């Protein structure tokens, strides 16, 4: 019943960066399978798809907003097309998360990061994975914050495992 | 793998006039749940609600497409907020159908069907059931068109067997 | 500075059905514009176009909402570009009335006739323009409405200065 | 007929952080005006508002894009209501740009920093005005970009005669 977005790099899922992220993207989502978590990702490919894969390995239930006109990975359990372009198609993915999780990306995936802050929405940055996961992280405000109204903390986790340990710390 | 969209009144699900429809909404929701359909519908009372109990009842799945961040009748598989006022949620809905069965419904089940037209999504008015629904059946250009481009047929039904007939019959 | 949009056919502006509009449109234009109104409108062709063009000639400011990418008439005194397609730019383009003004029209001007409706906002039929301006009128509850809400009321006005004149008389 | 698009900090035009940018705004606004160019914004108060008094102040045109049903600051030529949020309203606010120029600002700047570039809209950050027109400048890829993919280049320029020779420079 607890809805994590989860966001990340797109792009070809057998070439870098996203492919060095295999592991961590299939962890990452049968873990959210198995505690039972509804998972919702941006639906294209790249982390987007091994996440997806993770969580339909696992039994879990998995929903893809996507973007015009896509198609959106094979492992979605629902594909929700939406008619918007990518960033706008961000902002209604935001609007489905109690908490998102990120996953190296690009500029996409960092507008969805601040979004996600503005929308006061938690956001759990998934360190070690690079990209602007990595990056945003070099300029919190009191190391918690992307701005002055401190609208919802940013975390960091460094494993999967202290990653939905965050979450259910709420 | 087929989406059909189902629209009409929103309303309490106990009174007029949408509780004159609960067989016929809850005859709708079980066939197309038999027959292998994924539902989707606006996420809220009246007609949605019954349709998609229906749907639930018979172990199918059925997707709301919420306006805001609403919460949406609680027979919903999955709910999908949007952050969307209630005309833009129907257009991202309407992109979400192969088929659109309309029932009843006032001013925005007939911005859905016309919608419906202008996407190029066939149309089933379900008529008899008041509202929209047979209210838009008295304009309708060659008896089958909602204008001169002729986008796609608006087809008619009395019956949920002749509804979901008509679907099967594409 | 009362906001006035107005919706209607697109399409070449010098062929049927818009060509026989062309004084009806320069002339809402140029009145409209004396009158003192800021106009809005689709920003394309059409109806559109005319009475950009009858607003101009007249010195007034038109303001054209577009739809997606597109470049929108030659007459606009500004051009909104938003990112939206068709039906969404227009729930944008009726945020931006006070009243509306109907002239002929296919779908996108029913859906639009419809929408303004359901945002509350009065509408003004010009009768005898043809298209749906003039089918919409044959399904209207109380002669007056286009729901059972009875939102707000639907006037009809057989000329440009019966029109202005409702404007005016709120 | 060229348009830039100007953002920063909202809230109180004569309260921190905001009023100790009066001079640069107000600087900004009127040298754009004289320069001829039509000026966009997101209407409410704050940079917005000194911007656009600016502009007013030297004769120029200056178009604000609304987020919802708002009002919008009192010197803007033409107020567009869009019925969105502020991220979306953001998004239509950007196609509207050949060139962005930034001031201050918290996350809802950033966000429109950022998509400026996913978007292929050149982006002027104004030096010294903090917020996150500075802090942005922490995180450049070769000192120019916002991602891997290099879209765009993000230039700096500590004043306002340096901003628009840069925007001159095209």
């Given at each position: 019943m607890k809805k994590v977005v989860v966001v990340g790099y797109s792009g070809p899922?057998?070439?870098?960066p996203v492919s060095e992220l295999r592991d961590i993207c299939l962890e990452l989502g049968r873990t959210l399978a198995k505690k039972g978590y509804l998972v919702f990702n941006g639906?294209?490919?790249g982390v987007m798809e091994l996440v997806s894969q993770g969580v339909r390995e696992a039994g879990g239930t998995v929903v893809g907003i996507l973007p015009d006109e896509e198609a959106g990975?094979?492992?979605?359990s629902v594909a929700v097309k939406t008619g918007l372009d990518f960033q706008m198609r961000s902002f209604v993915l935001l609007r489905n998360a109690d908490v998102v999780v990120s996953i190296g990306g690009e500029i996409g995936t960092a507008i969805e990061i601040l979004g996600a802050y503005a929308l006061g929405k938690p956001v759990i940055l998934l360190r070690g994975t690079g990209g602007w996961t990595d990056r945003i992280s070099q300029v919190l405000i009191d190391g918690?914050?992307?701005?002055?109204?401190?609208?919802v903390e940013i975390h960091q986790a460094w494993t999967v495992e202290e990653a939905v340990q965050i979450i259910e710390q709420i």
């Open positions: 899922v057998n070439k870098s639906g294209r490919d990975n094979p492992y979605l918690k914050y992307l701005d002055n109204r401190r609208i």
